[PDB]
Design a protein around this ligand. Structure first.
Ligand SMILES: OC[C@H]1O[C@H](O[C@H]2[C@H](O)[C@@H](O)[C@@H](O[C@H]3[C@H](O)[C@@H](O)[C@@H](O[C@H]4[C@H](O)[C@@H](O)[C@@H](O)O[C@@H]4CO)O[C@@H]3CO)O[C@@H]2CO)[C@H](O)[C@@H](O)[C@@H]1O
Ligand SMILES: OC[C@H]1O[C@H](O[C@H]2[C@H](O)[C@@H](O)[C@@H](O[C@H]3[C@H](O)[C@@H](O)[C@@H](O[C@H]4[C@H](O)[C@@H](O)[C@@H](O)O[C@@H]4CO)O[C@@H]3CO)O[C@@H]2CO)[C@H](O)[C@@H](O)[C@@H]1O
Ligand SMILES: OC[C@H]1O[C@H](O[C@H]2[C@H](O)[C@@H](O)[C@@H](O[C@H]3[C@H](O)[C@@H](O)[C@@H](O)O[C@@H]3CO)O[C@@H]2CO)[C@H](O)[C@@H](O)[C@@H]1O
Ligand code: CA
Length: 854
């Protein structure tokens, strides 16, 4: 309901009114009040601490609450303020933090002879714990908790260990205008019964929950010398093994599939890892809503039936959509409890298997040379309110963990039920959760979904806390833990309205990565929410119009790409296409923001593809001329991935980039099932032409999709898929062949990286990037590379051979990179350098890497 006033401190209420009284009713009877308190205007106004925490109400009038008021009692009541007649509810987070900020133990604490439970519920009238013996059995016992400063607690005997439980919370819910008895899980849960119906009272440190040699994992972690050595591969746990016939049927789709060391999927990851891939980013793997943890409840359509339907038919999606709410599939961006592994990915959803198997997965990946990144989703909740298994946080302290507008309505810009990390206990829970995953599961990094919705102070505190973990004290080397996220700035958090948020610009100089949407859009063309047929640097703009000024548009995109290739730095200086020398931050995007915004290459996550939006293969198939062969499109796929793999900064690959993965042009496949998200590690298909994708997100584009999906010339064969994989692995090998591709500082990049095809007379469709190392005695720089003294990369998107003469690079000892001399691709082997003129000759649609050997 309507809540326009804010209770910001124990003694201050803020309200934007041009006499004011506070009314309270413990029974929610409001006439009907048990308390009436006149508020006096506070001539001192709002303190600086209040305006800093809640900038959007800095203009509001301040009213003093008399110190004789029992604030702790009143916050448990139905409350209104009235002006003299305007009446409105009160938003309590400010006063709840001021009075009841709590840093003590929450959830379960185990000592030698006892177990304690602590729940933060300062607005609750009563809290009990209901114990169950077993995940499905009836209640065995109820015990009352005692309150101190808004925290409810009880201490019991050690025998309480491994019971299941829920909290019975009597609390006022504004959405129902009643004090309701709510049955709630523990926000600090570390395990659950199926679907989070009950919390398992488990000691996360219990030795039987640790796989063999778990405590020695630190010794077995893959080497990571620098964050600048990171490459990331983004993978969904179910996608990985759902279709993998080399994994036993009962272990497909979950954590256990990673324990099959010689499966097609694991052999695929070993191949990438051995080539130099360092990190695998797993899509949400905590307790999310939308998939039943009980596998026998899953509905699946028969894939053999779906395979009989025409390639451009709407029948496949109709079938999938009919049961998409009851199938095994979701990306999982629907948070319920952050600190527990998803039950649907475990062999048994009740109790220990989800803990052990998660740990086994981390161990398995580490032992094949891959560090593990978790996709963490702290920006919103699946559900709010007092009802249902899927609401926990807002069930216990309504209106606190969620961000609300100035009328008191929940903000939904993230998707639904935005969180308010600006509130003390939300911040606490986020950081506590991160430490849980880092310490209890030895996770190597975190990707923050909608980091722009998270306060920068939360991000920086998390970074500090994680980075200071040690092997001696905590079992993990915190100094190697890497953080990155989506720094999009929109809706209610834009322009720092709720405080300094984790936007791209605000995270410059923090050492926390953000996705570079500039290089993505310049390469592919347009934007995910723009015209689908708008072409870019690598999809035929100017050079190969699709038929649905452009020389200058192409050159503008080339400038944006080059800033990205040099780590997307604010201060890197480029000769722009007009001839003027410009800093990365002085080259602007179409919406007026600086292209280059980082202080370091480690703050840039360079990508052309991810789980969101169309796959690399699909975007290329939509934007390029219809007349191109699939053979040509395969080369274009390789060019895009190579621009990432040979960029300064941190390359990010979508799982399947390397094997032409399609989703039949689905732009948002979160609930599109295994059918549209198929990862085929037999390499027989890429999943192109499996029907029109679900109407929900795609129907407006079906007319462009249908003819392409139906055209057999668009579909690659196994040969194309294997060719893509081989060349992908080669370019990875090249990145890790020389530290020059992975410079660690902006200073190094400004000193060493130069672009050689620039200015108003630049050759369209070609980027030439040179990287210098020390050469000769008493050099101007340190020697980073023992094998090569100089590297030159030529990206040629033209459909014809090009010869680039660079006088600066003439009379040197350049050769084609040994990996490319040794390539299975016939075209790249034809690449050549001629010293007399410094001429680099590169075939059409090819990336050629040249080295000067020592
Ligand atoms: O198979 C028989 C061999 O068994 C033993 O070696 C194993 C290791 O025990 C495994 O853990 C693994 O280790 C490899 C890993 O597969 C490989 O990717 C690479 O790891 C790199 C990583 O890729 C890279 O990103 C970088 O950052 O650091 C990692 C190294 O820290 O190298 C690992 C080996 O060092 O596989 C090998 C088999 O290759 C046993 O020791 C051998 O004697 C035996 O032959
Ligand atoms: O939350 C529900 C929605 O979630 C998913 O949307 C994602 C997109 O898939 C991502 O691409 C991203 O969107 C970013 C975008 O990547 C980024 O470039 C930026 O785009 C702006 C652009 O800078 C600007 O010039 C202009 O053209 O508008 C663009 C979009 O407004 O910002 C986007 C975020 O605002 O993140 C979102 C998450 O919201 C999903 O695909 C959707 O179906 C779903 O609705
Ligand atoms: O179901 C009611 C719910 O509908 C609306 O939220 C939906 C989004 O509109 C929809 O896009 C989808 O969001 C997912 C993204 O598509 C996906 O890319 C990824 O980011 O995960 C998102 C969450 O799963 O689903 C939600 C939920 O159905 C509406 O905005 C809500 O207010 C409303 O409650
Ligand atoms: Ca589903």
């Amino acid at each position: 309901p309507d809540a326009r006033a804010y209770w910001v401190t124990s003694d201050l209420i803020a309200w934007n009114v041009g006499s004011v009284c506070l009314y309270a009713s413990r029974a929610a009877a409001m006439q009907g009040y048990d308390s009436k308190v006149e508020l006096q205007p506070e001539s001192a106004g709002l303190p600086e601490t209040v305006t800093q925490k809640f900038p959007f109400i800095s203009s509001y009038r301040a009213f003093r609450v008399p110190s004789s008021v029992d604030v702790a009692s009143l916050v448990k009541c139905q409350l209104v303020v009235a002006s003299f007649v305007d009446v409105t509810g009160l938003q309590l987070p400010g006063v709840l933090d001021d009075m009841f900020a709590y840093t003590g133990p929450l959830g379960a604490v185990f000592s030698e002879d006892s177990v304690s439970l602590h729940l933060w519920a300062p607005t609750a009238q009563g809290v009990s714990v209901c114990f169950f013996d077993g995940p499905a059995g009836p209640a065995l016992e109820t015990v009352q908790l005692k309150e101190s400063n808004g925290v409810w607690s009880v201490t019991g005997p050690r025998e309480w260990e491994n019971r299941y439980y829920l909290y019975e919370v009597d609390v006022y819910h504004p959405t129902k205008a009643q004090v309701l008895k709510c049955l709630a899980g523990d926000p600090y849960a570390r395990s659950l019964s199926a679907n989070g119906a009950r919390t398992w009272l488990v000691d996360i440190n219990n030795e039987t929950l640790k796989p063999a040699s778990w405590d020695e994992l630190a010794d077995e972690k893959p080497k990571l010398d620098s964050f600048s050595d990171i490459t990331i591969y983004e993978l969904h746990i179910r996608d990985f093994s759902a279709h993998d016939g080399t994994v036993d049927s009962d272990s497909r789709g979950g954590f256990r599939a990673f324990a099959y060391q010689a499966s097609a999927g694991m052999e695929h990851l070993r191949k990438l890892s051995d080539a130099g891939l360092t990190h695998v980013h797993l899509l949400p793997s905590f307790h999310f809503a939308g998939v039943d943890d009980i596998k026998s409840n899953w509905k699946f359509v028969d894939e053999c039936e779906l395979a009989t339907f025409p390639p451009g038919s709407d029948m496949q999606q109709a079938a999938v959509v009919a049961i998409q709410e009851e199938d095994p599939y979701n990306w999982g961006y629907n948070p319920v409890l952050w600190g527990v592994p998803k039950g649907s990915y475990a062999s048994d959803p009740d109790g220990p298997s989800r803990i052990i198997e998660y740990r086994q997965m981390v161990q398995a990946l580490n032992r094949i040379g891959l560090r593990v990144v978790m996709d963490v989703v702290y920006n919103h909740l699946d559900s709010s309110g007092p009802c249902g298994i899927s609401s926990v946080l807002d069930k216990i302290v309504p209106g606190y963990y969620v961000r609300r507008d100035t009328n008191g309505q929940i903000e939904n810009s993230a998707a639904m039920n935005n969180t308010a990390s600006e509130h003390f206990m939300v911040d606490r829970l986020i950081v506590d959760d991160l430490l849980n995953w880092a310490v209890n599961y030895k996770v190597d990094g975190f990707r923050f979904d909608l980091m722009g919705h998270i306060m920068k102070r939360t991000m920086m505190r998390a970074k500090s806390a994680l980075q200071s973990l040690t092997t001696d004290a905590h079992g993990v080397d915190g100094s190697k833990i890497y953080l990155y996220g989506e720094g999009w700035d929109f809706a209610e958090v834009a322009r720092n309205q709720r405080g300094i948020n984790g936007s791209q610009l605000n995270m410059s100089g923090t050492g926390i990565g953000s996705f570079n949407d500039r290089i993505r859009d310049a390469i592919n063309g347009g934007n995910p929410f723009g015209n689908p047929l708008q072409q870019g640097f690598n999809t035929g703009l100017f050079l190969e119009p699709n038929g649905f000024d452009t020389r200058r548009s192409l050159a503008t995109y080339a400038d944006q790409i080059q800033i990205g290739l040099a780590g997307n730095l604010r201060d890197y200086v480029l000769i722009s296409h007009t001839g003027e020398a410009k800093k990365g931050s002085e080259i602007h995007t179409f919406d007026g923001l600086p292209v280059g915004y980082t202080a370091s290459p480690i703050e840039t996550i360079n990508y052309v593809s991810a789980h969101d939006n169309e796959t690399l293969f699909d975007v290329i198939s939509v934007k390029t001329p219809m007349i191109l062969s699939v053979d040509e499109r395969c080369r274009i796929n390789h060019l895009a991935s190579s621009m990432m793999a040979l960029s300064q900064g941190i390359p990010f690959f979508h799982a399947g980039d390397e094997i032409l993965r399609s989703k039949s042009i689905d732009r948002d496949s979160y609930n599109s099932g295994d059918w549209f998200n198929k990862l085929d590690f037999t390499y027989e298909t890429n999943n192109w032409g499996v029907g029109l994708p679900p109407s929900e997100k795609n129907e407006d584009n079906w007319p462009l999709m249908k003819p392409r999906l139906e055209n057999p010339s668009f579909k690659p064969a196994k040969g194309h898929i294997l060719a893509a994989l081989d060349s992908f692995v080669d370019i990875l090998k090249i990145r890790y062949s020389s530290p020059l591709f992975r410079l660690s500082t902006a200073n190094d990049i400004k000193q060493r990286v130069r672009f050689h095809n620039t200015g108003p007379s630049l050759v369209p469709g070609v980027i030439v990037m040179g990287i210098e190392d020390a050469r000769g005695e008493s050099p101007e720089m340190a020697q980073l590379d023992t094998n090569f003294s100089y590297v030159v990369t030529v990206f040629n998107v033209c459909p014809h051979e090009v010869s680039m003469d660079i006088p600066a690079l003439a009379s040197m000892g350049f050769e084609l990179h040994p990996v490319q001399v040794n390539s299975s691709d016939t075209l790249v082997r034809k690449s050549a350098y001629e010293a007399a003129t410094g001429r680099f000759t590169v075939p059409g649609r090819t990336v050629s890497v040249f080295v000067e050997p020592r």
